[PDB]
Design a protein around this ligand. Structure first.
Ligand SMILES: [Mg+2]
Ligand SMILES: [Zn+2]
Ligand SMILES: [Zn+2]
Ligand SMILES: [Zn+2]
Lengths: 51, 171, 84, 107, 168, 97, 519, 229
RNA sequence: GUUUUCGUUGUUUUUU
């Protein structure tokens, strides 16, 4: 908490039980924590390797 | 000294008060607001010369509850005392702290230290006044005094007299 | 230096839609403030229709101070500024 | 040509006004932050764009004066704008009020 | 409440002593300066009136207003009763009494004659006419503002004014 | 919650000639306070009391040349931080010319 | 109108004059001397008089009145104080300008390296703009190797060589090149020296250095006293419902003032040289954080929790700061936002308004001779249904909470009173969608009070909005004066936005079911 | 000085057309009946046949149209296009007159050519945009009304009047009055926020989307890149 | 007793 700056936010989040899948799929996310520092489409665009 | 001033006023008229003679209504409203009021910038408001021919300009409409501004402009004679005013006056009351001189809307106050040494109080003689060799300061008498005090007091500016210089007193 | 003479007025001899809205709102608000009525009323309980009827025959005691860019202005009586 | 690129149409006069304003001062004026801020009108606009503090430092250092003639001055002071309905001053007059019947006389 | 035709006069730093009114030093304040403009900016001088001329003007204005009110039809009190307000009535009666008790010239003819005669600063001549004097030494004792001009030209003025004085 | 009136809505209203409408949206539907400012210094530096009817500009000793202003409270905030940053934004009810 | 009576005439601001604030005028506005960092006088209400939360500076609650003006939040306009700095400091946005003014005049005689003698400087001073004339003054000062004691014929100059001025840390340092190069005596430019040289500056000099004598001063550019805001500006802000966390401004003011008192203590005590330096720099970056905690290259003042401390500079620049988020954008009343639905049987210039919206939203109709009957019907009808008054406004300003009023229907209307008539059918209302690109996205529709909680619209009017009924939220605004209703009806109506000025074409047409049908 | 709701695409008839076709559409021929006005449509063909005042009037109008042809085809509209947003829908006005006053059949004309010519010359002056008395005021008036006058001439020349739709007294007078009224209603309203109007009218198009066009070229324009990509 | 009293920082996810 002392080093509040330069800290990643969102790696842990409240589990959703709105629906059953709101948990299941919720338990199988992935994230790329690069940030909008430079917008780009490569972090957002689907790639053939994602097949 | 009587001074003629281009006295003016701003009127905020209630929206229901529109009509043909509206401007003339303004007149009386000005007449009921200009008089009976003093200010440091002008002084005692006493009269408005040519009050039947006052120009207000083309009246403007307030964008709102419906009121109207009126820049009522005119010419008036309003009296105002000045410091160093060495003018004959009539005394109104006599007090040990200093005799009162009702000179216009104000009342002249004479300080304890601005009374001549030959002026001594003799309350027994009627009316209460000041007597000396060829000197008689009574009601309705012409006594030359100098207004030396001028301070703005929003409602009336006071005048303080001085009888402590050469050729001052009763003519 | 302020008022452009009525003949010197070089701008439109017609009322403008902005002037339309201003005059209508002002007159209807006035009569809503129990100001004198310059027209007749049949069923126009809301003052806006009364102001509209006033504008129809242009019996409105207002005057438009159309400001010129240089700083001067043109004064146009309602009844002399043509309906538009 | 850019407007015609997609095939859509835009009125001539408005973007003509655009290009003339681009050129009415003899050179090319940009919509860049400093380019618009290089203007020397009431700071109340250029500062409100961005970097407000720097523009205020420049203006106070010059002790500038704002005439409250921009519409932004009107909106952030909450009064009638000098546009359209506010491009004039509609006034209660006297020449037409005289035509009223005498019963309408204010008391 | 009441505005004025004189504007501007914002917060400035170049200050001057001309802020306290003073008659003997010829001070009239920033409001009553040498170069003033009316509502329309017309060039005009400050109005100064002697007490007797002021009395005639106020009397004639009051009688004209009374006759206009009558619309077809001379005392100070009846004229003072023109306006509204008990305090207004009191102050107008008091100022009319001040005018009556301190009008060195009584009727229209002598006040008019001295009006053409007295008319170089208008205010100094106005206060010379207003301040009743008898001879030169009294005038110089009572007026410290006219000490030296290399041409007093005042003995004739006082002689004629005393010739126009009200006898009793 | 109230409807946050976006700036593009302001711009479209301006193009619509909605002066009074937008004004009351910013005057009656939004912040609106009246204050008493000086005519000499042209600041809000006036001890004000309506019931006492006293308005003294401690900055300029001004009492008679004091004017009432019915303007948005956000304008008051703006004037406040302008003062707080040692900047003097002298409001003037007149025209210097 | 609705405000309590005030003899002050109704006027608006016509001009705004900028510039700096003199310390003398700072006291001329300072309603009370502030020297105590400590705010709550005895931790038992009534905060410290003469402190940062001085009640004399203003009142903060409902019942209390500002001791200065005599009124509370109802009329309390906020009042300012002054805190005398123990030592003159720099203004965060003027250090470049400190370098500028130090590149133009003498370090001892305090006057311009030239005068209008040379044609370049004279023509530079003929420029009306202050900043431009002063920067040209710089541009011609750099054409001279030394602070000329004579013509490059003494100009009253000191003659010492102009130091090389550099923004060295928070303050500046001047490399004096005294009698090929002498010992470089770059030193802390103490603000006292700068005050001296500024006072040496003649009014003609400051004028030609681009300044106004009656207004913003290089002397004023040096801070000698700081302003203490009214408590209204940084009030007790609720950290938890009732428990108030002290305002960030209050925190920083306390820090600055405690540092200032430390500086005040630096003299009477034993101060072995560098202690004064450290305490003065401490106070200095505290003051800087008062203007700007975001000093570049510095770890910003930060809360013990870890978050950085804010400044006034932050809340004035950005995307939704003071100007952006409170002045050019701010919330309004008599406004509603709800779902949109299709109403094929509805007219184009009407929106199907829920009874909730048409009821909660209302227009103040003044009681007139023609609407007296219907307005009285509305008042007697009730505040919890339609049509009906929920507040009746007296012509003087008094209001009645009809719902809480046990005699709701017993309000006899006076000609001049105002009745908050509930929004009827055919009421013109501003109509707003986000985003709103074209001016045709603002359209004035007539309220049609009809059930369901959506906005019922025509199909054709949806196409210019380029919106659908997949859950879009739409905005309605109710006029509150006759001027506004007239303006809506004559300059913002649905029929008035049919034609796009863009492609000088209509914005609307027959679509969907109707188009397939007409085919 | 017109608002963006009162102009409409109008085709100036003079600008296109073979000079021979243009002649046999615009020029008259009284002496030779082969290309003359047919006597059926007019009550004054005998007066028309052999007259010179009418011939010289129609001539002056013809060279006026030729001058307009130069003005448009060489200066204003140069290469391929002759349809432009101009005010006052002349076409609908003409059709309205025809259907109000029953301009069908081949009845002879009680209205003479000088009436048309005087009316046109009057109305050319009656167009008011910039008011005032200074010479630059009327110069700007001419500048504003040049295209409209040229188009009206391209539509309302006496020859076309008679050979096609033979406007009668009432028809012609109401046509002139309606043209003047619509033109005077076609003026810009002072006070419009034309800057913001332009801003929206340009931005909204950009809110929908190898040569540099569209948003790229827009941005090169708006940032004022010193050289485009 | 007419009247009558809640807020923010930060965090995540969202909505045509
Ligand atoms: Mg949506
Ligand atoms: Zn002041
Ligand atoms: Zn207060
Ligand atoms: Zn020196």
């Amino acid at each position: 908490q002392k080093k509040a700056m330069s800290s990643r936010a969102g790696v842990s989040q409240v589990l959703n039980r709105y629906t059953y899948s709101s948990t299941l799929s919720h338990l199988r996310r992935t994230n790329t924590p690069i940030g909008r520092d430079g917008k780009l489409a490569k972090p957002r665009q689907l790639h053939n390797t994602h097949w | 000294m009587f001074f003629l001033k281009d006295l003016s006023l701003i009127l905020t008229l209630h929206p229901s008060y529109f009509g043909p003679q509206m401007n003339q209504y303004l007149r009386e409203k000005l007449l009921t607001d200009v008089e009976g009021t003093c200010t440091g910038q002008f002084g005692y408001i006493v009269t408005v010369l040519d009050g039947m021919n006052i120009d207000v300009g083309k009246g403007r409409i307030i964008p709102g509850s419906g009121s109207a501004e009126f820049e009522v402009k005119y010419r008036a004679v309003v009296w105002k005392p000045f410091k160093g005013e060495v003018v004959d006056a009539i005394v109104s009351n006599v007090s040990p702290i200093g005799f009162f001189a009702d000179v216009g809307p104000l009342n002249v106050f004479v300080s304890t230290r601005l009374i001549p040494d030959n002026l001594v109080y003799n309350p027994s003689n009627s009316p209460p006044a000041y007597m000396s060799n060829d000197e008689l300061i009574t009601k309705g008498s012409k006594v030359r005094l100098k207004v030396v005090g001028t301070r703005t007091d929003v409602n009336e500016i006071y005048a303080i007299g001085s009888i402590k210089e050469d050729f001052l007193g009763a003519i | 230096e302020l008022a452009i003479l009525k003949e010197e007025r070089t701008t439109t001899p017609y009322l403008t839609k902005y002037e339309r809205a201003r005059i209508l709102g002002t007159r209807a608000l006035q009569i809503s403030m129990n100001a004198p009525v310059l027209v007749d009323i049949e069923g126009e309980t809301d003052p806006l229709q009364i102001a509209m009827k006033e504008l129809s025959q242009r019996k409105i005691p207002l005057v438009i101070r159309r400001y010129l860019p240089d700083g001067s202005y043109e004064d146009w009586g309602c009844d002399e500024l043509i309906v538009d | 040509n850019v407007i015609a690129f997609d095939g859509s149409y835009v009125n001539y006069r408005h973007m003509a006004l655009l290009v003339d304003v681009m050129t009415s001062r003899g050179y090319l004026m940009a919509i860049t932050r400093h380019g618009i801020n290089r203007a020397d009108t009431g700071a109340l606009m250029r500062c409100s764009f961005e970097e407000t503090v720097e523009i205020l430092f420049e203006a106070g250092a010059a002790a500038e004066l704002d005439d409250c003639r921009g519409v932004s001055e009107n909106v952030m002071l909450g009064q009638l704008a000098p546009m359209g309905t506010g491009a004039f001053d509609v006034m209660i007059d006297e020449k037409l009020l005289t035509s009223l019947p005498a019963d309408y006389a204010p008391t | 409440v009441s505005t004025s035709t004189v504007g501007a006069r914002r917060r400035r730093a170049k200050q001057q002593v001309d802020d306290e009114e003073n008659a003997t030093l010829l001070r009239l304040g920033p409001e009553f300066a040498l170069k003033q403009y009316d509502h329309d900016g017309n060039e005009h001088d400050l109005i100064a009136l002697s007490l007797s001329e002021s009395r005639l003007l106020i009397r004639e204005a009051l009688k004209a207003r009374s006759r206009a009110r009558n619309g077809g039809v001379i005392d100070d009190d009846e004229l003072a009763k023109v306006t509204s307000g008990a305090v207004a009535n009191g102050v107008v009666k008091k100022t009319l009494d001040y005018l009556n008790t301190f009008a060195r010239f009584k009727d229209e003819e002598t006040c008019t004659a001295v009006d053409q005669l007295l008319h170089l600063h208008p205010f100094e001549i106005a206060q010379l006419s207003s301040l009743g004097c008898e001879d030169v030494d009294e005038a110089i004792t009572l007026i410290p503002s006219l000490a030296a001009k290399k041409e007093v030209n005042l003995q004739r003025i006082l002689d004629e004014l005393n010739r126009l004085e009200d006898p009793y | 919650g109230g409807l946050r009136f976006g700036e593009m809505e302001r711009d479209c209203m301006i193009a619509h000639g909605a002066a009074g409408f937008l004004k009351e949206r910013l005057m009656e539907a939004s912040d609106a306070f009246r204050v008493h400012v000086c005519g000499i210094c042209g600041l809000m530096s006036v001890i004000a009391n309506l019931k006492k009817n006293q308005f003294e500009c401690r900055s300029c000793k001004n009492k008679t040349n004091i004017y009432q202003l019915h303007i948005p409270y956000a304008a008051k905030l703006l004037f406040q931080e302008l003062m707080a940053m040692n900047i003097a934004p002298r409001l003037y009810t007149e025209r210097s010319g | 109108s609705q405000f309590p009576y005030s003899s002050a005439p109704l006027r608006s601001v016509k001009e705004v004059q900028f510039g700096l604030l003199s310390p003398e005028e700072i006291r001329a506005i300072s309603v009370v001397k502030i020297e105590y960092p400590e705010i709550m006088d005895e931790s038992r209400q009534r905060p410290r008089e003469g402190g940062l939360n001085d009640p004399k500076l203003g009142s903060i609650d409902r019942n209390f009145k500002c001791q200065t003006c005599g009124e509370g939040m109802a009329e309390c306009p906020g009042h300012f104080g002054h805190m005398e700095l123990a030592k003159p400091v720099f203004h965060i946005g003027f250090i470049p300008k400190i370098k500028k003014v130090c590149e133009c005049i003498c370090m001892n005689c305090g006057k311009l390296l030239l005068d209008e003698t040379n044609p370049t400087m004279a023509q530079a001073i003929r420029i009306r703009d202050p900043k431009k004339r002063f920067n040209a003054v710089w541009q011609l000062c750099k054409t001279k190797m030394v602070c000329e004691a004579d013509a490059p014929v003494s100009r009253g100059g000191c003659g010492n060589t102009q130091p090389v001025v550099r923004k060295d840390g928070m303050k500046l340092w001047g490399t004096w090149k005294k009698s090929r190069d002498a010992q470089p005596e770059r030193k802390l430019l103490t603000p006292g020296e700068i005050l001296n040289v500024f006072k040496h500056i003649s009014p003609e000099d400051c004028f030609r250095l681009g300044f106004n004598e009656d207004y913003a001063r290089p002397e004023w550019m040096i801070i000698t006293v700081l302003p203490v805001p009214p408590p209204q500006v940084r009030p007790s802000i609720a950290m938890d419902e009732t428990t108030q966390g002290q305002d960030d401004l209050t925190h920083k003011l306390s820090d600055i003032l405690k540092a200032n008192i430390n500086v005040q203590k630096l003299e009477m005590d034993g101060s072995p040289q560098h202690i004064i330096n450290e305490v003065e720099q401490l106070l200095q970056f505290h003051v800087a954080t008062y203007m700007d905690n975001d000093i570049a290259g510095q770890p910003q003042a930060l809360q013990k929790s870890g978050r950085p401390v804010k400044a006034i500079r932050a809340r004035l620049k950005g995307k939704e700061g003071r100007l952006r988020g409170n002045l050019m954008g701010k919330r309004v009343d008599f406004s509603a936002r709800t779902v949109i639905s299709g109403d094929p049987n509805l007219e184009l210039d009407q929106v199907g308004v829920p009874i909730s919206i048409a009821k909660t939203l209302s227009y103040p109709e003044t009681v007139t001779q023609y609407n007296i009957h219907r307005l009285t019907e509305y008042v007697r009808n009730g505040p919890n249904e339609h049509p009906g008054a929920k507040y009746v406004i007296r012509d003087n300003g008094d209001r009645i909470d009809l719902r809480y009023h046990k005699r709701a229907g017993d309000i006899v209307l006076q000609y001049g009173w105002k009745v908050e008539r509930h929004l009827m059918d055919d009421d013109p209302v501003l109509f707003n969608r986000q985003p709103s690109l074209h001016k045709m996205s603002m359209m004035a529709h007539r309220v049609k009070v009809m059930p369901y909680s959506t906005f019922r619209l025509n199909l054709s009017v949806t196409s210019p909005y380029n919106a659908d009924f997949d859950g879009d939220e739409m905005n309605l605004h109710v006029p509150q004066s006759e001027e506004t209703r007239a303006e809506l009806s004559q300059l913002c109506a649905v029929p008035l936005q049919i034609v796009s000025p863009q492609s000088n074409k209509p914005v609307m047409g027959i679509v969907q079911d109707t188009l397939c049908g007409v085919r | 000085g017109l608002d963006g709701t009162q102009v409409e695409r109008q085709t100036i008839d003079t600008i296109p057309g073979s000079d021979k076709a243009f002649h046999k559409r615009y020029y008259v021929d009284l002496m030779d009946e082969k290309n003359s006005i047919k006597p059926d449509v007019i009550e004054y063909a005998a007066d028309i046949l052999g007259d010179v005042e009418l011939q010289k009037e129609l001539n002056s109008e013809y060279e006026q149209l030729v001058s307009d042809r130069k003005f448009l085809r060489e200066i204003v509209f140069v290469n391929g296009d002759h349809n432009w947003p101009l005010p006052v829908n002349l076409r609908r006005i003409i059709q309205n007159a025809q259907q109000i006053f029953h301009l069908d059949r081949a009845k002879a004309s009680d209205l003479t050519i000088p009436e048309i010519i005087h009316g046109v010359r009057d109305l050319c002056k009656k167009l008011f945009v910039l008011r005032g008395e200074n010479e630059l005021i009327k110069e700007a008036q001419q500048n504003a009304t040049s295209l409209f006058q040229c188009l009206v001439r391209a539509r309302l020349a006496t020859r076309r009047i008679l050979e096609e739709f033979r406007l009668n007294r009432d028809a012609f007078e109401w046509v002139l009055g309606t043209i003047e009224a619509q033109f005077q209603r076609s003026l810009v309203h002072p006070g419009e926020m034309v800057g913001v109007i332009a801003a929206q009218s340009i931005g909204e198009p950009a809110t929908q989307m190898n040569v540099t066009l569209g948003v790229p070229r827009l941005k090169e324009i708006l940032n004022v890149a010193k050289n485009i990509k």
